[PDB]
Design a protein around this ligand. Structure first.
Ligand SMILES: *[C@@H]1O[C@H](CO)[C@@H](O[C@@H]2O[C@H](CO)[C@@H](O)[C@H](O)[C@H]2NC(C)=O)[C@H](O)[C@H]1NC(C)=O
Ligand SMILES: *[C@@H]1O[C@H](CO)[C@@H](O[C@@H]2O[C@H](CO)[C@@H](O)[C@H](O)[C@H]2NC(C)=O)[C@H](O)[C@H]1NC(C)=O
Ligand code: NAG
Ligand code: NAG
Ligand code: NAG
Ligand code: NAG
Ligand code: NAG
Lengths: 99, 162, 254, 99, 120, 49, 50
C-alpha cells in the first residue's frame, strides 16, 4: 500500500471508463438497449421515441462522466501544482518551511 | 480547421477537427448465408447477432456449449462460426480522431493530418505511437517542441517537419 | 401397464448440506480471467438439500414440487437412475414431459401421458421391462439423442422452465466418496434447451428395478430448490468456472 | 390535396400511419404541418349501379415518399414469372376501382 | 453508426462539442501539469563518470546503465509496483523522457547544489 | 418503498451507485481532512502542573 | 408518471451531488491550507509575509 495514491487515480479513471461503457447496456426505459434492434423491429415514428430515450439516457451519462472528470482534473491539477512547488522548493533549493 | 474554429485565420498549433471511421466494405451473414471474409472491416450477422468489426483467426479455446465470447465490457470479442466450427476474434474497426497540424495562416497554408491511434496501412507517411502522420517529413534531428503531436513527437515549420 | 410396489419400508427422507454445489453456467458466453456477477435462479450455498435413498428395502419415488427450478444430484453406480417426469397433473388432462435413458438412447417426448402411480424401468439378471405410462395421444415434441449417462459416478442436473423453454444443465463427475456429497466446486455445463412450451409444477424420478419380487440397486439422490439470487463466478484463463461466491449467504461473501 | 377514399381509410391520412393508401397512394411526412379535412360524399360520389371512377393503387413494388404521386400505368410482377407488359398469371393491373 | 440516431441527436445542439472541448481541455491540462512538474530545467545535466562523492552513494537513485529503460532501481521498482468511441491519447512526455528530466535534476542537485535552479 | 418505482429505476443502470460512491468519497475525505489538519503529532504532550 | 418523477428526482440528486463535490473540493483546499498553517505557523516560525 505504499503507492496507493497513484493506484487510486488509476483505479478511479478505469472505473469511470468502465461505468461509462457499461451505461450503454441500459435501456433507460426503452424496449431495448441496442439501437439496431429498435431500428429493425419498429417503425420510425415509435423508433424515434425509443432512440430519443436512449439518447437522453446516454447523454446524461456522458455529461455526468465529464462532470466528475473535470472535478478530478481540478484535484489532479491542485496536486500537480503542489508537486511543482515541492520540486522548486525542496529539490532545487533548501526549504525552511516546516514539514 | 477554419470551419471548425469558426475563423478565417488559424493560429499555430494542432486542432482536433474530425473523426475517422473505417467504413464497412462488405456485409457478411452466417446462418446454420454469404461467404466468410476475414481480416477486413465488415458488417457481420452471426446467428442474429449483428455488429461491425474485423474478423481474425483466434487462438481461444471455446468449450462446445460456448458460442460467442464477451470481454470485460460485455462486448462480443470472439465468435464461433455456426457452419465451420472455428473461433474468430472481432476487433473493432479502426476509429480515431483527425487532427490538423498547421502553422499560422500568416506564415503558411501547408497542413499535415494526424490520425490518432490508427496504423498507417489502414488509411510523407510516418508512423508514430500517437498515430499515423500524413504530410509531415520525419527528420533525425532533435529540436524544441513547437506543435505537440504526442508520444515524444512534435511538429514544426521550417515544409512541415516532425 | 402399471404395477404397484408394496414391499417398501417406511422411513422419513433425510437432509444434508449442499456445500458449494449446484452452480451451472448461466449462459452460452465464453469468459476468460474475469469475475462475473449474474442474477439467476441458483441453488444457495450450504443449503438444506433433501436426501433420498435406494437400498435393500428403500425405493424413494415420492411426488415432489418443482417450484422455480430443481437441482438433482445423484451418487450413482451400476445405472439405476434412468429419467425424469415433468408436468402439472401427470395425466392425460394436461401435457407432460418424458425424459428416459434406456439401454440404447435418450428419448424426450412431450405428450399427454396417462402416467402410472409407480413409473419404473427394469433390468433382468438385459432391459425388458418398461412401465411408465399407459397411453400417449397428443404428441407435440420429440427428441432422440445420445446417452447422457462404493458410488463411483456423480450426476448433477439443473432443471429450469422459463418462457416455455426447458433448460437442462448437466455435469458428470468421477468420485470415490461412499455416502454423501463431496465438498468441492464443479460448474454444471448446459446440456440441452428444449422448446416444450408447457406448464410444469411437479416432477418424478424414474428408477430401475433389478430382477433375478424386485430388488433395488444401491443409489442415492438429492433434491434441492433454486431461488432467484446473485452469484459472483470466477472464470480462469481457459474459460472454466473455478470458484463462486453466493452474494446473499454471509456478509463476507456479500 | 384533394381526393376521394373509403370511410375506414380516413385514419390513414395522418403522419406516421401504416396502411394501404398511405404506402402506395398518398403519404404524409412525419414532420407534416397542416390540417386533414374529410366529409361524407355518399350523395355525390356514389351511384346505385356502382361509381367506378375512383381508383387506387392495389399493387406497387415499394412505398412512396411523402407527397409523391404515381400515375404510371405499368404492369406489376406479382410472381417469379415476368409479365412483359401483358396480363396473365400473377400479372395484375395496379389501378383498381372502388365499388 | 446509426444515421437516424445522429439525426435525432442533432436536435439537442452543441452538447457533443461541449463535451469534446471539456475533454480536450483536460487532456492538454495533463500535459501542462507534466511540463510544470518535470520540465523546470532547460539544461540536461549529467553526472561525472567517477562517482566520488565523499562516501555518498547514489546508485539507487541515479539511472542504471544496465537497464534498457535508463531508469533508477527505485524508479524501476515504482514502475513495476504500479499496475465504443473511447480513445486514450498518449502523454506528450514519454516515460524515458520524464526519467531523463529527473536524471537531469538529480545530476544538477548532486554536482551543483541549488545553484543550477537559480542560474548557471 | 414503491417496488414499481425501483423496477423502473433499474432501467437507468448504475446512477445510484455513482452517487453513493461520490458521497462516500466526500465522507472519507472529511475524515482525511481532519486527520491531516489536527493529527500532526504522534505524542500527546501535557503542560507541567 | 413514475418515470417523470424518477427523472426529476434523479436530476435533483445529481445536481446536489455535483455541488457537494464542488464544495468538497473547496473545503479540501481550505483544509490543505489549514494543515500548511498548522505545520508552518504552529510547529515552527515562518518567514513568509502575511
Ligand atoms: C397403484 O396404486 C395407485 C394408488 O393406490 C392406484 O391409483 C388409484 O387407482 C384407483 C382406480 O380405481 C383410483 O380410484 C384411485 O383414486 C387411484 N389413486 C391415486 C392416488 O391415484 C393405481 O390404480 C394402482 N395400480 C394398479 C394397477 O392397480
Ligand atoms: C553503492 O551502493 C551499491 C548498491 O548498494 C553498491 O553495489 C553493491 O556492491 C556490493 C559489493 O560489490 C555487491 O555485493 C552488491 O550486490 C551491489 N549492489 C547492487 C544493487 O549492485 C556499491 O558497491 C556502492 N558503492 C559504490 C562506490 O558504488
Ligand atoms: C433441514 O430441514 C429439516 C426439516 O425440513 C430440519 O429438521 C433439519 O434440521 C434441516 N437441516 C439444516 C442443516 O438446516
Ligand atoms: C429405447 O427407446 C426407444 C424409443 O421408444 C426404442 O426405439 C428403443 O428400442 C429402446 N431400446 C431398448 C433397449 O428398449
Ligand atoms: C388430444 O387428444 C384427445 C383424445 O385423443 C383429442 O380428442 C383432442 O382433440 C386432442 N387435442 C389436441 C390439441 O390434439
Ligand atoms: C400452471 O399450473 C398451475 C397449477 O396447475 C396454475 O396455478 C398456473 O396458473 C399454471 N400456469 C400457467 C401459465 O398455465
Ligand atoms: C489452462 O490450460 C492450460 C493448457 O493449455 C494449462 O496448462 C493450465 O494449467 C490451465 N489453467 C488452469 C487454471 O487450469
Amino acid at each position: 500500500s505504499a503507492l496507493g495514491k497513484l493506484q487510486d487515480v488509476v483505479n478511479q479513471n478505469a472505473q469511470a471508463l468502465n461505468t461509462l461503457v457499461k451505461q450503454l447496456s441500459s435501456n433507460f426505459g426503452a424496449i431495448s438497449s441496442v439501437l439496431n434492434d429498435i431500428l429493425s423491429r419498429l417503425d420510425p415514428p415509435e423508433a424515434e421515441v425509443q432512440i430519443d430515450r436512449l439518447i437522453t439516457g446516454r447523454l446524461q451519462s456522458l455529461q455526468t462522466y465529464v462532470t466528475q472528470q473535470l472535478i478530478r482534473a481540478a484535484e489532479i491539477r491542485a496536486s500537480a501544482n503542489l508537486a511543482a512547488t515541492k520540486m522548486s522548493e525542496c529539490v532545487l533549493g533548501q526549504s525552511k518551511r516546516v514539514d | 480547421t477554419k470551419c471548425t474554429l469558426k475563423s478565417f485565420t488559424v493560429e499555430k498549433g494542432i486542432y482536433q477537427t474530425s473523426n475517422f471511421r473505417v467504413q464497412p466494405t462488405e456485409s457478411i451473414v452466417r446462418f446454420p448465408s454469404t461467404n466468410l471474409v476475414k481480416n477486413k472491416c465488415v458488417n457481420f450477422n452471426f446467428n442474429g447477432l449483428t455488429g461491425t468489426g474485423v474478423l481474425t483467426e483466434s487462438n481461444k479455446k471455446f468449450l462446445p456449449f460456448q458460442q460467442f465470447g464477451r470481454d470485460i465490457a460485455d462486448t462480443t470479442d470472439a465468435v464461433r462460426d455456426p457452419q465451420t466450427l472455428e473461433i474468430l476474434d472481432i476487433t473493432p474497426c479502426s476509429f480515431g480522431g483527425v487532427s490538423v497540424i498547421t502553422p499560422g495562416t500568416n506564415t503558411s497554408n501547408q497542413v499535415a493530418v494526424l490520425y490518432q491511434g490508427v496504423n498507417c496501412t489502414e488509411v510523407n507517411v510516418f508512423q508514430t505511437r500517437a498515430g499515423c502522420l500524413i504530410g509531415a517529413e520525419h527528420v533525425n534531428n532533435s529540436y524544441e517542441c513547437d506543435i505537440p503531436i504526442g508520444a515524444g513527437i512534435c511538429a514544426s515549420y521550417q515544409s512541415i517537419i516532425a | 401397464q402399471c404395477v404397484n410396489l408394496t414391499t417398501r419400508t417406511q422411513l422419513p427422507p433425510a437432509y444434508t448440506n449442499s456445500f458449494t454445489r449446484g452452480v451451472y453456467y448461466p449462459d452460452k458466453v465464453f469468459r476468460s480471467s474475469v469475475l462475473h456477477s449474474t442474477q439467476d435462479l441458483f441453488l444457495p450455498f450450504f443449503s438444506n438439500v433433501t436426501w433420498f435413498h435406494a437400498i435393500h428395502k428403500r425405493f424413494d419415488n415420492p411426488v415432489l414440487p418443482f417450484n422455480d427450478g430443481v437441482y438433482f444430484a445423484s451418487t450413482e453406480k451400476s445405472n439405476i437412475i434412468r429419467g425424469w417426469i415433468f408436468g402439472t397433473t401427470l395425466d392425460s388432462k394436461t401435457q407432460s414431459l418424458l425424459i428416459v435413458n434406456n439401454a440404447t438412447n435418450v428419448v424426450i417426448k412431450v405428450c399427454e401421458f396417462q402416467f402410472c402411480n409407480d413409473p419404473f424401468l427394469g433390468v433382468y439378471y438385459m432391459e425388458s421391462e418398461f412401465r411408465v405410462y399407459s397411453s400417449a395421444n397428443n404428441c407435440t415434441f420429440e427428441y432422440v439423442s445420445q446417452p447422457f449417462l462404493n458410488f463411483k459416478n456423480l450426476r448433477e442436473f439443473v432443471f429450469k422452465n422459463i418462457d416455455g423453454y426447458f433448460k437442462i444443465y448437466s455435469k458428470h463427475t468421477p468420485i470415490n466418496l461412499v455416502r454423501d456429497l463431496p465438498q468441492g466446486f464443479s460448474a454444471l455445463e448446459p446440456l440441452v434447451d428444449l422448446p416444450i412450451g408447457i406448464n410444469i409444477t411437479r416432477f418424478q424420478t424414474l428408477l430401475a428395478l433389478h430382477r433375478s419380487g424386485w430388488t433395488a440397486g444401491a443409489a442415492a439422490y438429492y433434491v434441492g430448490y433454486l431461488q432467484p439470487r446473485t452469484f459472483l463466478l470466477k472464470y480462469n484463463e481457459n474459460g472454466t468456472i473455478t470458484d463462486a461466491v453466493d452474494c446473499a449467504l454471509d456478509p463476507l461473501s456479500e | 390535396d384533394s381526393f376521394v377514399i373509403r370511410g375506414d381509410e380516413v385514419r390513414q391520412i395522418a403522419p406516421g400511419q401504416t396502411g394501404k393508401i398511405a404506402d402506395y397512394n398518398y403519404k404524409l411526412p412525419d414532420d407534416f404541418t397542416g390540417c386533414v379535412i374529410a366529409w361524407n360524399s355518399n350523395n355525390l360520389d356514389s351511384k346505385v349501379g356502382g361509381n367506378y371512377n375512383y381508383l387506387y393503387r392495389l399493387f406497387r413494388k415499394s412505398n412512396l415518399k411523402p407527397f409523391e404521386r404515381d400515375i404510371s400505368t405499368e404492369i406489376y410482377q406479382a410472381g417469379s414469372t415476368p409479365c412483359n407488359g401483358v396480363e396473365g398469371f400473377n400479372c395484375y393491373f395496379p389501378l383498381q376501382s372502388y365499388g | 453508426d446509426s444515421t437516424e440516431c445522429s439525426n435525432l441527436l442533432l436536435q439537442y445542439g452543441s452538447f457533443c462539442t461541449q463535451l469534446n472541448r471539456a475533454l480536450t481541455g483536460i487532456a492538454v491540462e495533463q500535459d501542462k501539469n507534466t511540463q510544470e512538474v518535470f520540465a523546470q530545467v532547460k539544461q540536461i545535466y549529467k553526472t561525472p563518470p567517477i562517482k566520488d562523492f565523499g562516501g555518498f552513494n547514489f546508485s539507487q537513485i541515479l539511472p542504471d546503465p544496465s537497464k534498457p529503460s535508463k531508469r533508477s532501481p527505485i524508479e524501476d521498482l515504482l514502475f513495476n509496483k504500479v499496475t465504443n468511441g473511447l480513445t486514450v491519447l498518449p502523454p506528450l512526455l514519454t516515460d524515458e523522457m520524464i526519467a531523463q528530466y529527473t536524471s537531469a535534476l538529480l545530476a544538477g542537485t548532486i554536482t551543483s547544489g541549488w545553484t543550477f535552479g537559480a542560474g548557471p
